[PDB]
Amino acid sequence: SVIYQTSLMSALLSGVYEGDTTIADLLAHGDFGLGTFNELDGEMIAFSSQVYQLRADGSARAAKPEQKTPFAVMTWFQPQYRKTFDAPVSRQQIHDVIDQQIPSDNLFCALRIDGNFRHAHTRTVPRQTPPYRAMTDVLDDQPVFRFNQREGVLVGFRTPQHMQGINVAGYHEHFITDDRQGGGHLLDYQLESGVLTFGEIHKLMIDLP
Amino acid sequence: SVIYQTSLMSALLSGVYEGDTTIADLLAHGDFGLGTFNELDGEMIAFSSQVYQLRADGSARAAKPEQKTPFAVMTWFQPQYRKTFDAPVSRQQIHDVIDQQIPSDNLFCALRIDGNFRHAHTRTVPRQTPPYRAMTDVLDDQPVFRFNQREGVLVGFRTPQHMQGINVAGYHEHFITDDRQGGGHLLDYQLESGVLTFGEIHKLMIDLPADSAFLQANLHPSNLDAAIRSVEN
Numbered sequence: 001s002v003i004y005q006t007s008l009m010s011a012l013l014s015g016v017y018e019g020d021t022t023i024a025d026l027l028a029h030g031d032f033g034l035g036t037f038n039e040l041d042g043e044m045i046a047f048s049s050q051v052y053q054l055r056a057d058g059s060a061r062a063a064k065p066e067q068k069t070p071f072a073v074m075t076w077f078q079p080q081y082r083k084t085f086d087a088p089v090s091r092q093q094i095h096d097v098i099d100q101q102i103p104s105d106n107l108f109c110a111l112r113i114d115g116n117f118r119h120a121h122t123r124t125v126p127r128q129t130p131p132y133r134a135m136t137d138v139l140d141d142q143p144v145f146r147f148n149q150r151e152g153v154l155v156g157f158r159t160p161q162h163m164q165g166i167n168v169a170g171y172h173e174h175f176i177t178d179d180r181q182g183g184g185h186l187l188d189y190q191l192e193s194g195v196l197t198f199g200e201i202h203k204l205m206i207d208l209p
Numbered sequence: 210s211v212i213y214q215t216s217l218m219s220a221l222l223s224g225v226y227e228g229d230t231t232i233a234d235l236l237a238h239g240d241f242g243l244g245t246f247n248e249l250d251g252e253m254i255a256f257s258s259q260v261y262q263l264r265a266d267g268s269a270r271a272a273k274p275e276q277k278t279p280f281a282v283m284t285w286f287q288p289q290y291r292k293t294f295d296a297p298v299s300r301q302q303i304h305d306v307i308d309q310q311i312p313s314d315n316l317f318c319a320l321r322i323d324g325n326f327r328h329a330h331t332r333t334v335p336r337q338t339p340p341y342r343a344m345t346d347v348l349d350d351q352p353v354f355r356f357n358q359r360e361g362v363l364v365g366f367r368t369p370q371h372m373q374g375i376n377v378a379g380y381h382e383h384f385i386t387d388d389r390q391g392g393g394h395l396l397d398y399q400l401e402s403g404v405l406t407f408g409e410i411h412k413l414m415i416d417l418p419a420d421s422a423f424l425q426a427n428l429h430p431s432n433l434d435a436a437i438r439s440v441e442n
């Protein structure tokens with residue numbers, strides 16, 4: 001049970017938008033994860049060994065193995081816990097449940113939700129052309145996508161505070177709809193109903209750029 | 210070709226001085242490295258899959274496979290570069306040489322020197338008793354040993370600056386004498402003559418402990434870099 005990542009989140013935010021790790025490589029390190037693609041071309045989400053690309057123009061595609069990534073986090077998902085939510089529940093309330101069960105911040109968590117989302121807000125980063133700006137300074141218009149009563153899959157990690165530059169500290173969740181056509185990096189959501197699985201991980205492996 | 214480490218420098222700093230990783234475990238992840246031992250009992254140096262414990266009372270001994278460590282760094286040493294020195298050369302100049310060859314700071318380096326050290330100072334951390342205090346708050350004297358015109362072995366890593374809590378950022382080097390009876394954690398040194406070998410590494414593997422002291426520790430203290438620098442230099 002091992003968190004694998006390609007490159008550093010510090011390195012990404014710095015404008016290092018290309019890397020030589022392939023989707024082929026990713027799937028050798030996990031069946032489960034998230035990240036982005038070279039040239040910052042969309043959001044990556046992965047589960048059950050399926051890897052999807054979520055792009056600005058709302059389109060979506062299964063990823064090609066040869067496609068490359070400048071940042072991704074993978075594991076072999078092995079949840080320890082199941083929660084059934086039969087009434088609406090906020091993203092933060094979800095996190096309160098997991099935080100209460102796995103209170104140490106010095107571990108990783110991985111978590112999946114299958115369910116109906118009452119509300120979901122994503123961003124999906126647009127493809128960038130060189131020379132690369134810092135991500136906080138993407139001059140390109142990038143909208144907040146909104147989903148209401150949409151069935152979908154959520155994939156996420158909770159990363160220790162003290163690893164802020166290495167990975168995304170705290171909760172980092174990606175989302176894709178049932179039809180596998182929309183989603184992205186989640187900014188907030190409310191679950192109408194669904195099934196949560198999660199667990200702790202305490203091994204970290206980094207391929208450096 | 211992988212940097213293996215058990216726990217984090219962060220954790221050791223905060224006072225988590227007991228781990229469950231054994232020396233035998235370490236040796237399954239490399240033939241080369243450095244660290245400390247449970248209860249902060251001294252310095253560990255490892256090379257040619259030989260492991261030594263340098264203690265605060267000046268004793269040196271082969272480590273036992275079943276001894277535990279709260280923090281250690283290992284790899285299978287596969288140097289790509291080699292430079293010999295026939296004239297003296299400072300610790301910084303050594304680092305300058307490696308930096309010229311491996312300028313990327315996204316990479317780790319492992320380095321070994323075999324030779325005659327004109328000068329060296331080493332520290333060895335003193336064994337602690339619970340309740341453990343943080344390293345910036347240790348009450349015991351921390352002995353410094355001096356070596357002049359001594360043959361020996363230097364083992365070291367270069368860690369990317371942006372990984373300062375995970376590991377010891379920058380250069381971290383340990384030392385033992387030819388007769389394996391003195392050394393420890395290097396503070397300064399000057400090589401009289403000898404042979405440098407080193408190489409680049411771009412994979413890092415961290416085992417996080419699951420014991421209670423580790424799980425409760427604060428690993429993002431205020432001025433992390435300054436704190437670690439006050440302890441490692």
Ligand SMILES: [Cl-]
Nearest residue numbers: 034035036185
């Ligand atoms: Cl992302």
Ligand SMILES: [Cl-]
Nearest residue numbers: 243244245394
């Ligand atoms: Cl050390």
Ligand SMILES: [Zn+2]
Nearest residue numbers: 035172173185
């Ligand atoms: Zn994201």
Ligand SMILES: [Zn+2]
Nearest residue numbers: 381382383394
């Ligand atoms: Zn040391």
